[PDB]
Design a protein around this nucleic acid. Structure first.
Ligand SMILES: [Mg+2]
Ligand SMILES: [Mg+2]
Ligand SMILES: [Mg+2]
Ligand SMILES: [Mg+2]
Ligand SMILES: [Mg+2]
Ligand SMILES: [Mg+2]
Ligand SMILES: [Mg+2]
Ligand SMILES: [Mg+2]
Ligand SMILES: [Mg+2]
Ligand SMILES: [Mg+2]
Ligand SMILES: [Mg+2]
Ligand SMILES: [Mg+2]
Ligand SMILES: [Mg+2]
Ligand SMILES: [Mg+2]
Ligand SMILES: [Mg+2]
Ligand SMILES: [Mg+2]
Ligand SMILES: [Mg+2]
Ligand SMILES: [Mg+2]
Ligand SMILES: [Mg+2]
Ligand SMILES: [Mg+2]
Ligand SMILES: [Mg+2]
Ligand SMILES: [Mg+2]
Ligand SMILES: [Mg+2]
Ligand SMILES: [Mg+2]
Ligand SMILES: [Mg+2]
Ligand SMILES: [Mg+2]
Ligand SMILES: [Mg+2]
Ligand SMILES: [Mg+2]
Ligand SMILES: [Mg+2]
Ligand SMILES: [Mg+2]
Ligand SMILES: [Mg+2]
Ligand SMILES: [Mg+2]
Ligand SMILES: [Mg+2]
Ligand SMILES: [Mg+2]
Ligand SMILES: [Mg+2]
Ligand SMILES: [Mg+2]
Ligand SMILES: [Mg+2]
Ligand SMILES: [Mg+2]
Ligand SMILES: [Mg+2]
Ligand SMILES: [Mg+2]
Ligand SMILES: [Mg+2]
Ligand SMILES: [Mg+2]
Ligand SMILES: [Mg+2]
Ligand SMILES: [Mg+2]
Ligand SMILES: [Mg+2]
Ligand SMILES: [Mg+2]
Ligand SMILES: [Mg+2]
Ligand SMILES: [Mg+2]
Ligand SMILES: [Mg+2]
Ligand SMILES: [Mg+2]
Ligand SMILES: [Mg+2]
Ligand SMILES: [Mg+2]
Ligand SMILES: [Mg+2]
Ligand SMILES: [Mg+2]
Ligand SMILES: [Mg+2]
Ligand SMILES: [Mg+2]
Ligand SMILES: [Mg+2]
Ligand SMILES: [Mg+2]
Ligand SMILES: [Mg+2]
Ligand SMILES: [Mg+2]
Ligand SMILES: [Mg+2]
Ligand SMILES: [Mg+2]
Ligand SMILES: [Mg+2]
Ligand SMILES: [Mg+2]
Ligand SMILES: [Mg+2]
Ligand SMILES: [Mg+2]
Ligand SMILES: [Mg+2]
Ligand SMILES: [Mg+2]
Ligand SMILES: [Mg+2]
Ligand SMILES: [Mg+2]
Ligand SMILES: [Mg+2]
Ligand SMILES: [Mg+2]
Ligand SMILES: [Mg+2]
Ligand SMILES: [Mg+2]
Ligand SMILES: [Mg+2]
Ligand SMILES: [Mg+2]
Ligand SMILES: [Mg+2]
Ligand SMILES: [Mg+2]
Ligand SMILES: [Mg+2]
Ligand SMILES: [Mg+2]
Ligand SMILES: [Mg+2]
Ligand SMILES: [Mg+2]
Ligand SMILES: [Mg+2]
Ligand SMILES: [Mg+2]
Ligand SMILES: [Mg+2]
Ligand SMILES: [Mg+2]
Ligand SMILES: [Mg+2]
Ligand SMILES: [Mg+2]
Ligand SMILES: [Mg+2]
Ligand SMILES: [Mg+2]
Ligand SMILES: [Mg+2]
Ligand SMILES: [Mg+2]
Ligand SMILES: [Mg+2]
Ligand SMILES: [Mg+2]
Ligand SMILES: [Mg+2]
Ligand SMILES: [Mg+2]
Ligand SMILES: [Mg+2]
Ligand SMILES: [Mg+2]
Ligand SMILES: [Mg+2]
Ligand SMILES: [Mg+2]
Ligand SMILES: [Mg+2]
Ligand SMILES: [Mg+2]
Ligand SMILES: [Mg+2]
Ligand SMILES: [Mg+2]
Ligand SMILES: [Mg+2]
Ligand SMILES: [Mg+2]
Ligand SMILES: [Mg+2]
Ligand SMILES: [Mg+2]
Ligand SMILES: [Mg+2]
Ligand SMILES: [Mg+2]
Ligand SMILES: [Mg+2]
Ligand SMILES: [Mg+2]
Ligand SMILES: [Mg+2]
Ligand SMILES: [Mg+2]
Ligand SMILES: [Mg+2]
Ligand SMILES: [Mg+2]
Ligand SMILES: [Mg+2]
Ligand SMILES: [Mg+2]
Ligand SMILES: [Mg+2]
Ligand SMILES: [Mg+2]
Ligand SMILES: [Mg+2]
Ligand SMILES: [Mg+2]
Ligand SMILES: [Mg+2]
Ligand SMILES: [Mg+2]
Ligand SMILES: [Mg+2]
Ligand SMILES: [Mg+2]
Ligand SMILES: [Mg+2]
Ligand SMILES: [Mg+2]
Ligand SMILES: [Mg+2]
Ligand SMILES: [Mg+2]
Ligand SMILES: [Mg+2]
Ligand SMILES: [Mg+2]
Ligand SMILES: [Mg+2]
Ligand SMILES: [Mg+2]
Ligand SMILES: [Mg+2]
Ligand SMILES: [Mg+2]
Ligand SMILES: [Mg+2]
Ligand SMILES: [Mg+2]
Ligand SMILES: [Mg+2]
Ligand SMILES: [Mg+2]
Ligand SMILES: [Mg+2]
Ligand SMILES: [Mg+2]
Ligand SMILES: [Mg+2]
Ligand SMILES: [Mg+2]
Ligand SMILES: [Mg+2]
Ligand SMILES: [Mg+2]
Ligand SMILES: [Mg+2]
Ligand SMILES: [Mg+2]
Ligand SMILES: [Mg+2]
Ligand SMILES: [Mg+2]
Ligand SMILES: [Mg+2]
Ligand SMILES: [Mg+2]
Ligand SMILES: [Mg+2]
Ligand SMILES: [Mg+2]
Ligand SMILES: [Mg+2]
Ligand SMILES: [Mg+2]
Ligand SMILES: [Mg+2]
Ligand SMILES: [Mg+2]
Ligand SMILES: [Mg+2]
Ligand SMILES: [Mg+2]
Ligand SMILES: [Mg+2]
Ligand SMILES: [Mg+2]
Ligand SMILES: [Mg+2]
Ligand SMILES: [Mg+2]
Ligand SMILES: [Mg+2]
Ligand SMILES: [Mg+2]
Ligand SMILES: [Mg+2]
Ligand SMILES: [Mg+2]
Ligand SMILES: [Mg+2]
Lengths: 44, 76, 63, 97
RNA sequence: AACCUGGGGAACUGAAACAUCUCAGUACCCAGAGGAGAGGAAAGAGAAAUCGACUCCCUGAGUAGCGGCGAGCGAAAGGGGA
RNA sequence: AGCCAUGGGGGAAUCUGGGCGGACCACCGCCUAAGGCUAAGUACUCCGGGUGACCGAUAGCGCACCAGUACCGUGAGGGAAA
RNA sequence: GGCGUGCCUAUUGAAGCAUGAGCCGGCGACUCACGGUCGUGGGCGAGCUUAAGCCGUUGAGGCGGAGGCGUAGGGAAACCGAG
RNA sequence: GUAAGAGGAGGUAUAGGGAGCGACGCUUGCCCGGUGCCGGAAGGUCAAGGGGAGGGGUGCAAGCCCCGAACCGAAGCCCCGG
RNA sequence: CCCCGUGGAGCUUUACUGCAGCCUGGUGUUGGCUCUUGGGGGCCUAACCCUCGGAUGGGGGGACAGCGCUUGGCGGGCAGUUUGACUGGGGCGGUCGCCUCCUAAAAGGUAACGGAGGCGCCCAAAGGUCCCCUCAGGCGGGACGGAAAUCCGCCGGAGAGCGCAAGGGUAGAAGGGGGCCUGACUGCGAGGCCUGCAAGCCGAGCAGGGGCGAAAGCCGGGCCUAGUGAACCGGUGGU
């Protein structure tokens, strides 16, 4: 499944690739945004 | 007849022989695996590509059981 | 009579002051998915042509 | 009969709307190097009166050159060229529009 | 004879195929006008609190734009003139 | 996707009236639709004249000459030689 | 007596049993317009040049700067500027 | 035939149009699932339109302007049979 | 005859796209009375249509039909076109991009409808870092086991493993296990490889803010080489 991360308290995006059915229901790895610095990023 | 196939030629092998002057960052050798090990002043990339790390001269060293090496002896 | 500028070209290329010709890198609006972040950062910089720079220039001239 | 190179892509956004052109004041730049080509005083009128301006209307003095002390009118000045002329003389801004 | 206005109106061709598109409101058919015909005293232009009927030339300009944004098509305000 | 024109349906007002300035709204401005006429500058060349770094009888108009003829074709039409 | 496989065309290759031509005379095919891009001969030069038109003339030229190219680039642009 | 109109016919189902077989004799069997055609006041899908919960642009406001859900909407197709 | 040409034309259909025609809702032409829950049923006459020995009228149909504008549908009756290339002639068959190996003549490159095989994915652990461990196999001994499960001993340098074809590489790890972890980062990028173009590939280091480590350091995914698609047109988010 194709995917793109969204930044919290905001709406940044980034390149990504989930995997759906396989062990991966939730997803929120870290990633550095341009504005501010370092924050969690939801699946979406 | 199922057979008329093959894949692109990758033009690999040694890209800079011994004694040849080299600029920092330029490539020394492209290879399938580590047919050549890095060594002094020579880094290696994801594909096993060897690239000079500073202006200098290329020289090759064989070390038997430990394999062949590519070196850049600096000077400036 | 009177050559017409090629609008298709003008809409995607520029003549530099020295007579060079530049355009955005191709392949960055589709194939996208997670190609190394490095790639797309480098698909942003525009580049110069070579021989079609001359083919290209002819298509302008009033420009 | 394959692709030309029309494979390249348009970036030049806003290549046009229906009525198209929007009439906005055009500024022509003019270096004070060619400005020192004489003396007395300078205004838009005088500048077009020889080579430069060519009725591009809005004058904007700027750039490299050794500035003569003279007074000069313009619709705008270079942040840097302003200091050079201010540092040897004087000069007023635009009329208004 | 040609020039003009109005009512109708192609295709080969170009797009290196082809249907939008092009050729073109061209070729041609029809009605009418006259030494010309049309147009014509702003329910205009469009950015200047500016211009001042219409027609014609130069320019603006292969610009603004239009376009299977392909092939290609292509103005006006303004300025110089009759 | 305004503006101009209008085949179909609905359908006002007379200046506290209407149109427009590129969807729409407000503001600021422009202009007065639904009657008609108007010279000149413009186009053309059957006709007359003038002039050619235009032809000189296989050229130049198809025709320098008794040619739109002889001849050809049911016909539209084709069309010489000299 | 010695020597000697037409001409053109097309071809890897033609005297060719591949093409075209009975012979002679005459007609007969890389042009012009506008716009480009190089080169070249000159005029002028941070300038260069006029278009329609007007006034002359009747194979005489002048006037006409409206306009165009150049003197600044970079950016999609707002904008900034030797950056 | 755009139309007016005309043929059909100055005829009227013992008539006229289309189709296939092709004097005459003896005959012409089984399949209606697919295709066509015929029949089917149900249902399903279905356009313009009607409708107007809800939402947006703008104005100080009266307002002007746009978007839009449920629901009501024919033939056709689906469906049911011959 | 045959083949070629992104030639032509006649014909065909459940090729594409249209057109005529036919079907159809709304609406104009379009009216009155009544029952009924804007719709439905019934009646009326005067629009409209047909007809009657002239008719300003009579009879028949009747707000239907016809016609106008608009909606959707059926639609080779008709129209414009498309219907690929390679190919020991063409059709038929097969093939078309990407990776591995051989052909390839010890740099690179190298053709044939030459010989052989794979790709159109996969993984939040199968990734990062720190720490630890080392295979396959053979022989001997061991309750189930029975050639092979798990345990012990001796030999064993790699014949195992490295997700998947092959190749190269590899235990002085790229392989197995564990702790913390998300660098499957942003802004760039000296200098190169490869190359007709456009593409593809490698990359030190600088800045920001980070992860593991005591630290030297390592991290811009995966041992590597396939896992892919210019531009146009449009979608969603944001400045
Ligand atoms: Mg997938
Ligand atoms: Mg999948
Ligand atoms: Mg077999
Ligand atoms: Mg092969
Ligand atoms: Mg080795
Ligand atoms: Mg690295
Ligand atoms: Mg793009
Ligand atoms: Mg474009
Ligand atoms: Mg306009
Ligand atoms: Mg006609
Ligand atoms: Mg056509
Ligand atoms: Mg055609
Ligand atoms: Mg064509
Ligand atoms: Mg041509
Ligand atoms: Mg062609
Ligand atoms: Mg064709
Ligand atoms: Mg099209
Ligand atoms: Mg046209
Ligand atoms: Mg026109
Ligand atoms: Mg006409
Ligand atoms: Mg007239
Ligand atoms: Mg006159
Ligand atoms: Mg007149
Ligand atoms: Mg008139
Ligand atoms: Mg007036
Ligand atoms: Mg405007
Ligand atoms: Mg005034
Ligand atoms: Mg004006
Ligand atoms: Mg004026
Ligand atoms: Mg002109
Ligand atoms: Mg388009
Ligand atoms: Mg046109
Ligand atoms: Mg004007
Ligand atoms: Mg002026
Ligand atoms: Mg004027
Ligand atoms: Mg308008
Ligand atoms: Mg109307
Ligand atoms: Mg009144
Ligand atoms: Mg009152
Ligand atoms: Mg109006
Ligand atoms: Mg107006
Ligand atoms: Mg308006
Ligand atoms: Mg206006
Ligand atoms: Mg406006
Ligand atoms: Mg105004
Ligand atoms: Mg006005
Ligand atoms: Mg008036
Ligand atoms: Mg009147
Ligand atoms: Mg009037
Ligand atoms: Mg009237
Ligand atoms: Mg008149
Ligand atoms: Mg003429
Ligand atoms: Mg003539
Ligand atoms: Mg004459
Ligand atoms: Mg004459
Ligand atoms: Mg002569
Ligand atoms: Mg003669
Ligand atoms: Mg003679
Ligand atoms: Mg003759
Ligand atoms: Mg005669
Ligand atoms: Mg004859
Ligand atoms: Mg003749
Ligand atoms: Mg001999
Ligand atoms: Mg010989
Ligand atoms: Mg010859
Ligand atoms: Mg012979
Ligand atoms: Mg022969
Ligand atoms: Mg031949
Ligand atoms: Mg011969
Ligand atoms: Mg020949
Ligand atoms: Mg003969
Ligand atoms: Mg030539
Ligand atoms: Mg030239
Ligand atoms: Mg010169
Ligand atoms: Mg001049
Ligand atoms: Mg003057
Ligand atoms: Mg003047
Ligand atoms: Mg730019
Ligand atoms: Mg009909
Ligand atoms: Mg009709
Ligand atoms: Mg009849
Ligand atoms: Mg009849
Ligand atoms: Mg009859
Ligand atoms: Mg019968
Ligand atoms: Mg019958
Ligand atoms: Mg039977
Ligand atoms: Mg039976
Ligand atoms: Mg059946
Ligand atoms: Mg059956
Ligand atoms: Mg049945
Ligand atoms: Mg059936
Ligand atoms: Mg079947
Ligand atoms: Mg069916
Ligand atoms: Mg059917
Ligand atoms: Mg029935
Ligand atoms: Mg129903
Ligand atoms: Mg059902
Ligand atoms: Mg539904
Ligand atoms: Mg609706
Ligand atoms: Mg508000
Ligand atoms: Mg409000
Ligand atoms: Mg408010
Ligand atoms: Mg407000
Ligand atoms: Mg409101
Ligand atoms: Mg609606
Ligand atoms: Mg119902
Ligand atoms: Mg229905
Ligand atoms: Mg069916
Ligand atoms: Mg039934
Ligand atoms: Mg083809
Ligand atoms: Mg139809
Ligand atoms: Mg109806
Ligand atoms: Mg209807
Ligand atoms: Mg009706
Ligand atoms: Mg009605
Ligand atoms: Mg009710
Ligand atoms: Mg009611
Ligand atoms: Mg009655
Ligand atoms: Mg009655
Ligand atoms: Mg009557
Ligand atoms: Mg009665
Ligand atoms: Mg009646
Ligand atoms: Mg009706
Ligand atoms: Mg109708
Ligand atoms: Mg139909
Ligand atoms: Mg059907
Ligand atoms: Mg259909
Ligand atoms: Mg069809
Ligand atoms: Mg053979
Ligand atoms: Mg064959
Ligand atoms: Mg065959
Ligand atoms: Mg085949
Ligand atoms: Mg091959
Ligand atoms: Mg396979
Ligand atoms: Mg692994
Ligand atoms: Mg150990
Ligand atoms: Mg064994
Ligand atoms: Mg044993
Ligand atoms: Mg044992
Ligand atoms: Mg044992
Ligand atoms: Mg045992
Ligand atoms: Mg047991
Ligand atoms: Mg056993
Ligand atoms: Mg045992
Ligand atoms: Mg053991
Ligand atoms: Mg032992
Ligand atoms: Mg080993
Ligand atoms: Mg081995
Ligand atoms: Mg191995
Ligand atoms: Mg393995
Ligand atoms: Mg593996
Ligand atoms: Mg291997
Ligand atoms: Mg080692
Ligand atoms: Mg591991
Ligand atoms: Mg490990
Ligand atoms: Mg673990
Ligand atoms: Mg650098
Ligand atoms: Mg580079
Ligand atoms: Mg390249
Ligand atoms: Mg090229
Ligand atoms: Mg680095
Ligand atoms: Mg740092
Ligand atoms: Mg690194
Ligand atoms: Mg990846
Ligand atoms: Mg892996
Ligand atoms: Mg790694
Ligand atoms: Mg690993
Ligand atoms: Mg490799
Ligand atoms: Mg396209």
């Amino acid at each position: 499944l194709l995917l793109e991360c969204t930044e919290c308290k905001r709406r940044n995006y980034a390149t990504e690739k989930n995997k759906r059915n396989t062990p991966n229901k939730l997803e929120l790895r870290k990633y550095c945004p341009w504005c501010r610095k370092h924050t969690v990023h939801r699946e979406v | 007849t199922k057979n008329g196939r093959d894949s692109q030629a990758k033009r690999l092998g040694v890209k800079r022989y011994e004694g040849q002057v080299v600029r920092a960052g330029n490539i020394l050798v492209r290879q399938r695996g580590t047919r050549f090990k890095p060594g002094k002043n020579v880094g290696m990339g994801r594909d096993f590509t060897l690239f000079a790390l500073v202006d200098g001269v290329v020289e090759f060293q064989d070390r038997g059981r430990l394999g062949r090496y590519v070196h850049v002896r600096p000077l400036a | 009579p009177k050559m017409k500028t090629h609008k298709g070209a003008k809409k995607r290329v520029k003549i530099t002051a020295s007579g060079k010709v530049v355009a955005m890198k191709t392949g960055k609006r589709h194939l996208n998915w997670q190609k190394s972040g490095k790639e797309i950062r480098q698909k942003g910089r525009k580049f110069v042509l070579a021989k079609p720079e001359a083919e290209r220039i002819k298509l302008l001239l009033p420009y | 009969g394959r692709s030309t190179t029309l494979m390249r892509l348009p970036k030049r956004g806003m290549q046009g709307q229906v009525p198209g052109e929007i009439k906005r004041p055009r500024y022509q730049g003019v270096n004070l190097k060619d400005l020192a080509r004489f003396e007395g005083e300078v205004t838009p009128e005088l500048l077009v009166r020889a080579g430069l301006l060519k009725k591009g209307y809005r004058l904007k003095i700027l750039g490299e050159g050794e500035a003569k002390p003279l007074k000069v009118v313009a619709h705008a000045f270079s942040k840097s060229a302003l200091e050079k002329l201010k540092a040897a003389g004087g000069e007023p801004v635009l009329l208004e529009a």
